């Protein structure tokens, strides 16, 4: 049920801005950063939306006019797509699946050029879609350094301490057109997802739903993404997609979503909601514990599977031999 913005400003959004899917979902809890339940959840690596962290309070004034004036003259990675679904791919891995034609190109440009491109597309009533996704780095202007320094490091550093996480590895800046969709995938790092401008619908699935979401092969360029097209699920190829259940939420300015490591997430900028801006915080997960405790947790089995695929890749001398070997192993033997 949509949240009513303060000052009686009506509903921030409504259901009609949500895309429709075949699976049911249940709400991710929205809580105060000071609520012990929110701590139990993060400790247990379950998603939670924190409403009042002030994690990126200085960024809440960011829009394209302000950033263009302040984010420096460095290069920004911008993805193009002829559709709302921005399927991404690892370039390094494109060698070993030549029957793979990309759905989205990456293009390096100056920020002001990206703003021009958006301006153009709107003006010309075009259909092309852009999505800026660029790591924050040294080349940013002084005003941005000051905003960045103003983030609530006291809070997030304590979170990194209490969870025994590794180092902050990066902050991804994401600027996206309304209707844009990042299809379901999982990441191998802990993620605090800080929403800044506009509204993003986030659908999460736990690691133990690996079986229902059918990730690409590890050596495929779309490694870690679901193969299932949520807009038209092929139940003949992916029968257990019929048993999938999401955790969902809509984050707005000031909201922080904890996306636990290995949790699948599908993310969309609300239809007719304007551009969206997010900054995320990626932390390496805690180390593997000295003593393993059985039964294994689902994310640990996903770790194992990934490793089996990787090793067979090396061992056979060719990742394209991995599938045939695995099938030889199970057919009439384990199935």
């Amino acid at each position: 049920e949509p949240r009513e913005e303060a000052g009686a400003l009506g509903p921030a959004w409504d259901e009609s801005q949500l895309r429709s899917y075949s699976f049911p979902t249940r709400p991710i809890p929205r809580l105060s950063q000071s609520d012990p339940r929110a701590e139990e959840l993060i400790e247990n690596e379950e998603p939670v939306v924190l409403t009042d962290t002030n994690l990126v309070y200085p960024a809440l004034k960011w829009d394209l006019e302000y950033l263009q004036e302040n984010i420096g003259n460095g290069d920004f990675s911008v993805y193009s797509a002829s559709t709302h679904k921005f399927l991404y791919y690892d370039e390094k891995k494109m060698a070993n699946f030549q029957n793979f034609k990309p759905r989205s190109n990456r293009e390096e440009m100056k920020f002001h050029e990206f703003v021009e491109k958006l301006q153009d597309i709107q003006q010309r009533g075009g259909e092309e879609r852009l999505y800026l996704q660029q790591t924050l780095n040294d080349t940013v202007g002084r005003k941005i350094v000051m905003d960045f320094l103003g983030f609530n490091w006291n809070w997030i550093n304590k979170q990194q301490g209490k969870r025994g996480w590794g180092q902050l590895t990066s902050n991804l800046l994401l600027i996206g057109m309304e209707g844009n969709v990042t299809p379901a995938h999982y990441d191998e790092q802990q993620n605090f997802f800080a929403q800044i401008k506009g509204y993003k619908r986030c659908i999460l699935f736990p690691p133990d739903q690996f079986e229902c979401l059918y990730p690409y092969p590890v050596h495929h360029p779309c490694d870690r993404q679901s193969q299932v097209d949520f807009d038209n699920p092929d139940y003949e190829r992916f029968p257990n997609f019929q048993n999938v259940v999401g955790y969902e939420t809509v984050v707005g300015p000031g909201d922080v979503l904890y996306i636990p490591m290995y949790w699948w997430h599908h993310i969309e900028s609300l239809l007719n909601g304007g551009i969206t801006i997010t900054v995320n915080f990626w932390y390496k997960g805690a180390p593997t514990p000295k003593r393993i405790e059985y039964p294994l947790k689902a994310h640990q089995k996903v770790a194992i599977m990934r490793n089996i695929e990787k090793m067979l890749g090396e061992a056979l001398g060719n990742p394209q031999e991995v599938g045939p070997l695995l099938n030889t192993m199970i057919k009439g033997r384990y199935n």
């Binding site: 993805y79 990441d187 790092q189 593997t288 640990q300 194992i304 490793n307």
Partner: peptide, 15 residues
Amino acid sequence: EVVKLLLEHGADVXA
């Protein structure tokens, strides 16, 4: 070794 080898994870994110 084995188990610790099979349990180690990469750090792959996003793009």
